[PDB]
Design a protein around this ligand. Structure first.
Ligand SMILES: Oc1c(Cl)cc(-c2ccc(Cl)c(Cl)c2Cl)cc1Cl
Ligand SMILES: Oc1c(Cl)cc(-c2ccc(Cl)c(Cl)c2Cl)cc1Cl
Lengths: 115, 114, 114, 115
């Protein structure tokens, strides 16, 4: 599992459950093509987005649909979504964990990259 | 000044200076049009991006070129850039401050709307 | 102004106003002595805590009463307060800005030393 | 396992390994008494600090020795340590995960609290 997303809710002190996540890969022309998508589980995690074989070198965008999340909670948040754009696997296969911490007007994102 | 950006460096404990910032507005056809751009100053701030007249309701993207910033410091960064996408909503008089706190493998962004 | 505190509210996207802040210096015998205190202003800032003459090298603790802040907003917080403990080091002319970004179950603090 | 600590390094994009963590409990007089201590593992996690039986209601302070961590890496950091002070178990036993994200001049801490 080379690409994992973990999302926490800083207002409730809990995992952010059912957050939609879309991943895109920058194509040979500089259009973002859809790559994978999913929703966080009860633990706020999203696994199984892709495989080592499919997860080739490139620039990827992970888009976390934070707006829908906060709206469903009755909070009107600032951001449309949180997005994380990174070059992946440019010197060999790595495992990427993209973690995000969400508040209505703020989010933080961190990457843990393992060999 | 309806839109201000402030960028801090969490590694050195200093403003992030000379960081390129590009602002885009979403156009009618799903597409991002250049709207404003600048480089953060010595205090890590960027002002005078736009005016109240010009800054109408819409979806905006603030793109902070964090990669070049870290590269200049000889530190290999994770992100291609930091992006902040938000709807400017205009109901009442509103100043938007977009602040980013930069680390090589992490960033945080917060909006202060006053 | 050698020491400044700024507190932001990540839930409402606003300065955190009227937040009590207490600053302590570590004394000779391992113990924390009151040093300065105040309440953040309408811009979520606290200035004039101390002077250059008084702010000597030492270990300082900045305690931000985040609990009362959230309680006033009817939101149950996790932390008793936020604490920031650092050595003031004085080598060269230095202003310390301590910024805190508050959420009910999380906070971030960063230091800007310029 | 009612109290867990997870520590990440935002400079290296990796878990923060071998970070010393001391936990204190506020005593019947308002002195912090030592409660538990340990070091983060290779995954940046610290488990087994305490048991449900021992982890009674009270105010706890988790102190993360960030200074030693950064010094061992040749970075001179700002903070002496990161500390998280919270009331625990005041309406029944909960499981607490204290997560911290470390940079030389900044850290963030979040709590995930589960039933
Ligand atoms: O800011 C944070 C961010 Cl963005 C993520 C985490 C975090 C907490 C628990 C886990 Cl298990 C992981 Cl992977 C992360 Cl990255 C913790 C903090 Cl304090
Ligand atoms: O995480 C933070 C972020 Cl994203 C921003 C700031 C911050 C520091 C100084 C200033 Cl002047 C401002 Cl407006 C901000 Cl929002 C402080 C922290 Cl701790």
């Amino acid at each position: 599992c080379p690409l994992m997303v973990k999302v926490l809710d800083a207002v409730r002190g809990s995992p952010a459950i059912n957050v939609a996540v879309h991943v895109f890969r920058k194509a040979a022309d500089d259009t973002w093509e859809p790559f994978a998508s999913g929703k966080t589980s009860e633990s706020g995690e999203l696994h199984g987005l892709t495989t080592e074989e499919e997860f080739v070198e490139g620039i990827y965008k992970v888009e976390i649909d934070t707006k829908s999340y906060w709206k469903a909670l009755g909070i009107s948040p600032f951001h449309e979504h949180a997005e994380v754009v990174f070059t992946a696997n440019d010197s060999g296969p790595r495992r990427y964990t993209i973690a995000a911490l969400l508040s209505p007007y703020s989010y933080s994102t961190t990457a843990v990259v393992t060999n």
